[PDB]
Each structure stands twice: as structure tokens, then as C-alpha cells.
Design a protein around this nucleic acid. Structure first.
Ligand code: MG
Ligand code: MG
Ligand code: MG
Ligand code: MG
Ligand code: MG
Ligand code: MG
Ligand code: MG
Ligand code: MG
Ligand code: MG
Ligand code: MG
Ligand code: MG
Ligand code: MG
Ligand code: MG
Ligand code: MG
Ligand code: MG
Ligand code: MG
Ligand code: MG
Ligand code: MG
Ligand code: MG
Ligand code: MG
Ligand code: MG
Ligand code: MG
Ligand code: MG
Ligand code: MG
Ligand code: MG
Ligand code: MG
Ligand code: MG
Ligand code: MG
Ligand code: MG
Ligand code: MG
Ligand code: MG
Ligand code: MG
Ligand code: MG
Ligand code: MG
Ligand code: MG
Ligand code: MG
Ligand code: MG
Ligand code: MG
Ligand code: MG
Ligand code: MG
Ligand code: MG
Ligand code: MG
Ligand code: MG
Ligand code: MG
Lengths: 48, 98, 136, 177, 48
RNA sequence: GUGAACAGCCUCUAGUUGAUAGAAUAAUGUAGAUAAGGGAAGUCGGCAAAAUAGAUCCGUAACUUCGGGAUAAGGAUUGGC
RNA sequence: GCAGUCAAGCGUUCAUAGCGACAUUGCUUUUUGAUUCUUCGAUGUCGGCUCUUCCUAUCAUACCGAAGCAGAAUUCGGUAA
RNA sequence: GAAUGUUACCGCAAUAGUAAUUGAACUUAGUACGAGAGGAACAGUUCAUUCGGAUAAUUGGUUUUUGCGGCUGUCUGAUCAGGCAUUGCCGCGAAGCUACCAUCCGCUGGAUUAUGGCUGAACGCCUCUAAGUCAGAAUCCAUGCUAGAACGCGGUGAUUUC
RNA sequence: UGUACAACGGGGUAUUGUAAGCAGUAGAGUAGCCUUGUUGUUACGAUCUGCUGAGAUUAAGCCUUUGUUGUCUGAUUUGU
């Protein structure tokens, strides 16, 4: 869909940027639920 | 999470947005965008650039109902009296005359 | 970097490739620092080894007290001007690139430091921390 | 942070403390003097209108009426003005000070009460303290008691009783003018 | 999903978003909500 | 007409609108441009390119065959009404 | 140019930790010579830029054996491109 | 891209390619070792180098959006709106492209080499070796990843009447 | 023949930085007629000001839409 910015506190015991805000980049994927419409089955064969 | 404003333009600077400029006198300048930040470098006067926050404030533009009051008074009036003389003797004996 | 520098350093946009000349900001006598190298830098055919805040370079003095000229010495970048970006999303930059002459173990040479100094630099260099009036 | 709440009508004052920063955020971007409904600060305070009077930030620096900003500035301060008690004659000094607009960098927030809510706040609305002194000049006694210049002061003044252990005594002011 | 299980630490950290940028992305966006835009420049020739 | 001007740039008279055409806008090119921070580290070499540029006023070094050097260098300033 | 064997000697002591004389056995074809087979009805003749790949007689990086290896540093060697 | 009845959808995987690299700080620890001077390493943590594949929230670059604004000449009587000067010049400029100049992400199982070992004869002793055998490397084979054999393949839908 | 699709028009978004027109006691000032001034007056004056964050452009690879108009059977080919 696109991307955007995010702000959050950082939990990372060790970093000079621990417990401090970090602006970060993120991507939003559109995910309206999927409909199941079939089932297919697979076997082991000595050639695939 | 502060939201500084453009020292020139005037609008808000949500996190990570625009640039920041530390001058030699160690004074900080934030710009929402390249536009102001250039018009800043270009020695332009904020009070001359019409859309700027500083322009409208100096030229008395769009204020309307802030151009009126509100409501912020109260009530008090009691008697804590003078201290060290029985504070009850100062409400009673205050019988007045006129 | 490497010796004397207590701390790490998150990556900041390199702004001073070798041969760059930056304002010296201490009472050493030196007026400028001319970068001949960068401590810690890596190798790739035809890359100039560049410098950023809190970096320790190797430099000389172009214009300064004659007892600093004609010889190589450490120096520490304190002002960038090449707009770098921090982990709080800020795209900030000083008005000029600048640095102070220092020693191997990483201590100052002059009394104080004239002008601003990045946090990135002070946090790394205990000795700088002192002299640096305003920071960031 | 911390709120120093004062009741002017009753001379009361208590220093309450609030974490839960979403509670505090009512105060943000509010100038010195702007009023504040109580239910936003808590429930104990519901109703109680609050006038914003002063306060302090980290490192202790004071606010100052009419400076705007939510930050520190270094002003030249004179006689007859806030945050500066001059030492020498016509002495001006350049000192730092905090902006008038509230932010999350304040150690304390000096509030006053304008109106009362649906709960008697403990060390505030319930408890009372006495105006530590009383009228001293002539027509100030007369106008504290409303007398019409007839009723002869002399005894229309307050008299403080102070016990000398085993010799309780009577000391009055001294009516000037 | 993931074909392994990352002890990572760098992943493991449950993060909590403070704020998500909703200013326009069709240029130099300034205001989050159409309210915030109004609560700033106020009333215009169309508008009110 | 602008301008020191037969320069550039626009126009009047006169004369032209002649040079295969259509559709797209991949790589690579020929020609024209701009780039953050650095500043010749590129290279045999600053090749190329960029910088400079009119005029009024101020200011001007070594050295000289005293004719020069010299727009030396370095500065300020310039519309409209 | 690189690698051996014998081991008189060096290494305080101790031939072979690390080295090695007098001799002698080899490998390599990025040196230079010797040759003159191929091209004189033309195989475009240095170097750099660039880009790929391969060799190992390994500079660094992985894991090891050895020391005249206390630690640190270094050295000799194995698997290793 | 013809041809293995037509057409469509979902897949398997031969063979082939293949990828990550190196450093530092904290900590260990002023520790072990040393009379002292000096002075480590495994585990853990935070960052970095070179490499690689992406991606455009932000920041920067780009400007024929000739989008808005300005300026110089001249031409349309002035006005309004405009034309011409190989895009006339100027400030700003969305979209797109794009930059360690921007941001993101770069898997873990096995088998071995050297080497050190167990058991153990030959050789009544001894020995990692002869039978047998354990542990082991930036190696190797997998895992993963990219292609998919247009003459390798499976599953499934639909299959025409003037 | 419909949650259709298209051309426009509308609203969001975005760029520039305040459109033309009109008005004004703004404006260095300036002309002319006297009825020669206890604002004489009518003009005219770079620029300014107000309606006016106004006007203008905004998908050409932005978002959206109860509005308007229109469009919806031409061709060729294939069989175990
Ligand atoms: Mg931009
Ligand atoms: Mg080179
Ligand atoms: Mg000199
Ligand atoms: Mg021709
Ligand atoms: Mg053509
Ligand atoms: Mg430009
Ligand atoms: Mg450049
Ligand atoms: Mg630029
Ligand atoms: Mg030079
Ligand atoms: Mg050179
Ligand atoms: Mg030469
Ligand atoms: Mg040369
Ligand atoms: Mg040239
Ligand atoms: Mg230029
Ligand atoms: Mg000359
Ligand atoms: Mg002038
Ligand atoms: Mg050789
Ligand atoms: Mg001997
Ligand atoms: Mg020995
Ligand atoms: Mg020959
Ligand atoms: Mg031939
Ligand atoms: Mg030939
Ligand atoms: Mg040839
Ligand atoms: Mg081989
Ligand atoms: Mg020994
Ligand atoms: Mg057939
Ligand atoms: Mg590498
Ligand atoms: Mg220590
Ligand atoms: Mg010892
Ligand atoms: Mg790329
Ligand atoms: Mg951009
Ligand atoms: Mg234009
Ligand atoms: Mg202009
Ligand atoms: Mg007009
Ligand atoms: Mg024409
Ligand atoms: Mg021409
Ligand atoms: Mg990269
Ligand atoms: Mg992978
Ligand atoms: Mg064996
Ligand atoms: Mg196939
Ligand atoms: Mg306006
Ligand atoms: Mg296209
Ligand atoms: Mg409509
Ligand atoms: Mg048939």
C-alpha cells in the first residue's frame, strides 16, 4: 500500500539509545481475509 | 515526543520531519521543510513572507473570536481573622455600625 | 577511535574525505586542520577514507603557530556541516566542519573549545566533554 | 510530576503528586493563568476549576508570567519583576528562566483553586488557617470593621494574647495615622 | 512465517508504538487529522 | 527598440515556412543542464568544466629600457518611481 | 627465483627450538640468456584505467601441531585459495 | 517462440548458479601468569568494516508539472491576458526516479581435513591404526536462496455443432 | 447492463504565496480651474492597504464520488 513513520520507546539493555524514542520506518500491507476454496495433497516419491 | 515549530514558517514539526541547523552562536533552527529552510538561508524576513505565522500575527490576520474575552473570575470573602486573639472574637465583635 | 575512546559510535554520514580542511576549535594556536587519514577506516579500491563526528583523524596544520606546521598529529572532528541523521530521526547539521587537535590516548591539546560540539563527540571523548561549552 | 495546589479563600495549600502522564497531559500547551477542569486531573478533584499560577522545572528554574515558550530563556531582569531580587542600586542581572507554557519538564506546577468540586479535598477545603496579622493604620481598622469615622478606634483593634508561662500578656499593634 | 526460531534478542523485544504518522504523503505533509488542520489555520473562504 | 555599437536579443518592409513521414521514449550514445558534504585526493598534466566578466567610484606590488607593469591586486555600488 | 638430503658448525650448555659450512639432489618458467620452429601479400608495439577469472610457492582471516611458548608479543610447521 | 488434441489454473524439481566479510569498545579483568615491569582468552553485550538484495516513511539531489511567483529586452495602442530570446533568466516546486548522502533485511543442519583421542593387536611389552572408533576448520554436502529442462513431470478446471 | 467503465463536474490531498475588479484619508509627490481656501477641489503619482492563505495548477503512474453525459457483440483461430 505504501509506508510511513513510527515512534516508539526502545528496550535494548546496552545501547546508547536504550529507553529512548526512535523514529522508525514501516510498511502497511492490506490484508482482508482470505477465503479457503480447496485442499490438495502431496506424496513422497523417490524423484520428488 | 515534542513537536517543535519552524523558526521562520511556524507550523509543527512531528518527529523526524524536516531539518535542523546549528548556527555558530549555538542557536538551533528547525524547519518543517526545504522551503522555509531555503527561504531562511535566503535571508528572507518571516514578517514579509505572507503565509508565515509571524506575518499574520504582526498584520492582525484571522483572529476573530480570540479578539474577545471568556470567563475567569471567582468568589471568596470569608474571615480567617487576625492571628493570636481567638479568631472567633473577630467575627462576633466585628458588629460594625453603618 | 580504537584507543582511548570509551564507547561505541552509531553510524553518522561521513562528511570529511581526506584532504578536507576544517576549522580548528581549540587554543592550540592552530587555525585549521587538514585531514590526511581517518583512524578505523576500511579499504576499497578508489574510496577516499572519510570522517564524521567523534572520529579521530590524522591531520596537519595549514595555517597556525609554526611549531604545529609541517608535522602530523591526531585530531577529533567536533563539527560536521554534512547533514547526518540520528536515531531520533533528526536530520541536523552544524554551520561549519571543525575539529580539535588531540593525542593518541585521546586527550585535548588546548584549554577549551570554541563553539558548539555534537553530543556524538562528547559522549565518546571524556576529555572533550569537559571543554565543550554548549553541546549539540 | 507534582502539583502545589493552593486554596486562596481559606489560606490552604497541599502538594499532591500525579504519575500517569496521560492525566498530566491536560496541562500541556496551557499558558500561565489558563483555567483547568478537575475531572481531567483526577476524580477527587472533579469540578474544581484550577487557575495556573506558577511552578518549577528541572534544575529548579522558575517560570515567568508572559514569556510564552515551553523552554528556557536568558533574560535581563530589573527591579520590580519576577524571579529577581536585586542586590545593589539599579542592579540588573542576566539570569535564565523557564517559559510560561506547561510541559513535561516541570518538577512542580503551582496551581490555585477557583471553584470547589463535589469532594472536600483533605488538607485544603476542610482545614483553615488564620490571616497571621490584623489592621494597623487608622482608616484601615475602620474599613476592616466598617465604622463611620465616629466609633473611635483605640479598642476596635485586635489584641494578641501571649502567655509568659505564668503571666499571660496582652499586646496590640500601634495605630499610625 | 519463519523457517527458524530467532533467539536474536533484537527480535524478541515486544515493541509498543507511541505514534503513527498519518500526515499526507502526497508531498510535504503537516497535519495528521483534518481536525488538526482546522485547529490551526482556522476558518477559510469556503469552510465556514 | 534596448544598448558604447553594423554585437547579442525582439520587431517594420521584403522574402520565407524549403530539409521523408507516423508511433513510442529501453540500453548506449551526440548535443544541452543540475547536483548534498568534501575540494584536484582524479589524471602524465586541472583535460574538461566551473569561477570571472559591463559601468561609476575608491584603491593598487616587485621590477623597469621610466614608454610600462595595470582592468595589477583589492573593494563598494547599480532597478523602479 | 624457489625446495631438498649429509650435519662440521651456530645457538652459554646442547648438531637438527630456530639456523647451517664444505658438498651434493632437485623443482619452477612472472628473470635473463641460448635457439630461431610459427607469422615479414602485416597477430596493432609500453604503461595505466577498467572487469573477469584462475594458480599457491598463504600476507591477513578459521581450526590446529611446535618452541631457547611463564604472561603478552613472536617465531616454525600442518589442513587451508 | 512453431511442434508433442485445444485452453486455463495450481504445483513437483533434474541440472545450474549461490554469499557473506573483517574489526573494535564494554564485560571478563587490572583477572589467570610473572618478583616486577607488565599482562590474555572462552560465554554475554553494544557497535562498526568491506560485500550483497532491496526499498522511497523521512532527509538530500533531480525539474518541461514549463505548477505558482518574480525579472530583463522587444512585439500585440493602453488595460487584462499574452507571444518571441535553440526550455530567456530567477526563487519555490509536488510526482517519479534516485544516494552508506537516505532507510530496511541478509538462514542452520549434517559430513569431514589437519590435529588431539578411545579401544587395540601385529611385536606376551608398547603404540590414535593395522580391524574397529570419538572429537574436530573461514573446507564439503545439505538447509535456504535465484533460475526451471522452451524435446523432465504431477495435480485440477473447461472443452465448440450450421 | 453493474460495486460496471469512461468523459467531465464536485469534495479531500498537494504546490505557489495573496488573483483580477473595486475601494481607500495610505504614498516621495504633482498638474489645472478659480469662487485664491479658516481638509478649496477635480483629476494624476513607483509602491501600500482591504475584500484575499486569496487566485491558479493539482494525475497526466495522487485519493474520492448517490451529480452530468456517454459507451457495452468488430476480427481470427483451435479437436483427444
Ligand atoms: Mg525536495
Ligand atoms: Mg585509483
Ligand atoms: Mg607559507
Ligand atoms: Mg537530410
Ligand atoms: Mg522520426
Ligand atoms: Mg535548482
Ligand atoms: Mg559538489
Ligand atoms: Mg541546491
Ligand atoms: Mg591544494
Ligand atoms: Mg595527484
Ligand atoms: Mg609530464
Ligand atoms: Mg607524474
Ligand atoms: Mg580548459
Ligand atoms: Mg554554480
Ligand atoms: Mg596582461
Ligand atoms: Mg537606488
Ligand atoms: Mg619462482
Ligand atoms: Mg657445539
Ligand atoms: Mg638442544
Ligand atoms: Mg623469435
Ligand atoms: Mg596473414
Ligand atoms: Mg589485422
Ligand atoms: Mg586481433
Ligand atoms: Mg585445484
Ligand atoms: Mg632449552
Ligand atoms: Mg493437430
Ligand atoms: Mg571481505
Ligand atoms: Mg579495567
Ligand atoms: Mg620471572
Ligand atoms: Mg541500489
Ligand atoms: Mg524528493
Ligand atoms: Mg514564469
Ligand atoms: Mg527576480
Ligand atoms: Mg490597472
Ligand atoms: Mg513572432
Ligand atoms: Mg536567433
Ligand atoms: Mg550498502
Ligand atoms: Mg538467506
Ligand atoms: Mg586409517
Ligand atoms: Mg517447462
Ligand atoms: Mg492578503
Ligand atoms: Mg510512462
Ligand atoms: Mg456535481
Ligand atoms: Mg478432422
Amino acid at each position: 500500500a505504501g509506508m510511513t513513520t513510527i515512534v516508539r520507546d526502545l528496550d535494548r539493555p546496552g545501547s546508547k539509545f536504550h529507553k529512548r524514542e526512535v523514529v522508525e520506518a514501516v510498511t502497511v500491507v492490506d490484508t482482508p481475509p482470505v477465503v479457503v476454496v480447496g485442499v490438495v495433497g502431496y506424496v513422497e516419491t523417490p524423484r520428488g | 515526543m515534542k513537536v517543535e515549530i519552524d523558526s521562520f514558517s511556524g507550523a509543527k514539526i512531528y518527529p523526524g520531519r524536516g531539518t535542523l541547523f546549528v548556527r555558530g552562536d549555538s542557536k538551533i533552527f528547525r524547519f518543517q521543510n526545504s522551503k522555509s529552510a531555503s527561504l531562511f538561508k535566503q535571508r528572507k524576513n518571516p514578517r514579509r513572507i505572507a503565509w508565515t505565522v509571524l506575518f499574520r500575527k504582526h498584520h492582525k490576520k484571522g483572529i476573530t473570536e480570540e479578539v474577545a474575552k471568556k470567563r475567569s473570575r471567582k468568589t471568596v470573602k470569608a474571615q480567617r481573622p487576625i492571628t493570636g486573639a481567638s479568631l472567633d472574637l473577630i467575627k462576633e465583635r466585628r458588629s460594625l455600625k453603618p | 577511535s580504537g584507543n582511548g575512546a570509551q564507547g561505541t559510535k552509531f553510524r553518522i554520514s561521513l562528511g570529511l574525505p581526506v584532504g578536507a580542511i576544517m576549522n580548528c576549535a581549540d587554543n592550540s594556536g592552530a587555525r585549521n586542520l587538514y585531514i590526511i587519514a581517518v583512524k578505523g577506516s576500511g579499504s576499497r579500491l578508489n574510496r577516499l577514507p572519510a570522517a564524521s563526528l567523534g572520529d579521530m583523524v590524522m591531520a596537519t596544520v595549514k595555517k597556525g603557530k609554526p611549531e604545529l606546521r609541517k608535522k602530523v598529529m591526531p585530531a577529533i572532528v567536533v563539527r560536521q556541516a554534512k547533514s547526518w541523521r540520528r536515531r531520533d530521526g533528526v536530520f541536523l547539521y552544524f554551520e561549519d566542519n571543525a575539529g580539535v587537535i588531540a593525542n593518541p590516548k585521546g586527550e585535548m591539546k588546548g584549554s577549551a573549545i570554541t563553539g558548539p560540539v555534537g553530543k556524538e563527540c562528547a559522549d565518546l571523548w571524556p576529555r572533550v566533554a569537559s571543554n565543550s561549552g554548549v553541546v549539540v | 510530576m507534582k502539583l502545589n495546589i493552593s486554596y486562596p479563600v481559606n489560606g490552604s495549600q497541599k502538594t499532591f503528586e500525579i504519575d500517569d502522564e496521560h492525566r498530566i497531559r491536560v496541562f500541556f500547551d496551557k499558558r500561565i493563568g489558563q483555567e483547568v477542569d478537575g475531572e481531567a486531573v483526577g476524580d477527587e478533584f472533579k469540578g474544581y476549576v484550577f487557575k495556573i499560577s506558577g511552578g518549577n522545572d528541572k534544575q529548579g528554574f522558575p517560570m515567568k508570567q508572559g514569556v510564552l515558550l515551553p523552554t528556557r530563556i536568558k533574560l535581563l531582569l530589573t527591579k520590580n519583576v519576577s524571579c529577581y531580587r536585586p542586590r545593589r542600586d539599579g542592579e540588573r542581572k542576566r539570569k535564565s528562566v523557564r517559559g510560561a507554557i506547561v510541559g513535561p519538564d516541570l518538577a512542580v506546577l503551582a496551581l490555585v483553586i477557583v471553584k470547589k468540586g463535589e469532594q472536600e479535598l483533605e488538607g485544603l477545603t476542610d482545614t483553615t488557617v488564620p490571616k497571621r496579622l490584623g489592621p494597623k493604620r487608622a482608616n484601615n481598622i475602620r474599613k476592616f470593621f466598617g465604622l463611620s469615622k465616629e466609633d473611635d478606634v483605640r479598642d476596635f483593634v485586635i489584641r494578641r494574647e501571649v502567655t509568659k508561662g505564668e503571666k499571660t500578656y496582652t499586646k496590640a499593634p500601634k495605630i499610625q495615622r | 512465517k519463519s523457517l527458524y526460531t530467532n533467539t536474536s534478542r533484537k527480535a524478541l523485544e515486544e515493541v509498543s508504538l507511541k505514534w503513527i504518522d498519518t500526515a499526507s504523503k502526497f508531498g510535504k505533509g503537516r497535519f495528521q487529522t483534518p481536525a488538526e488542520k482546522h485547529a490551526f489555520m482556522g476558518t477559510l473562504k469556503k469552510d465556514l
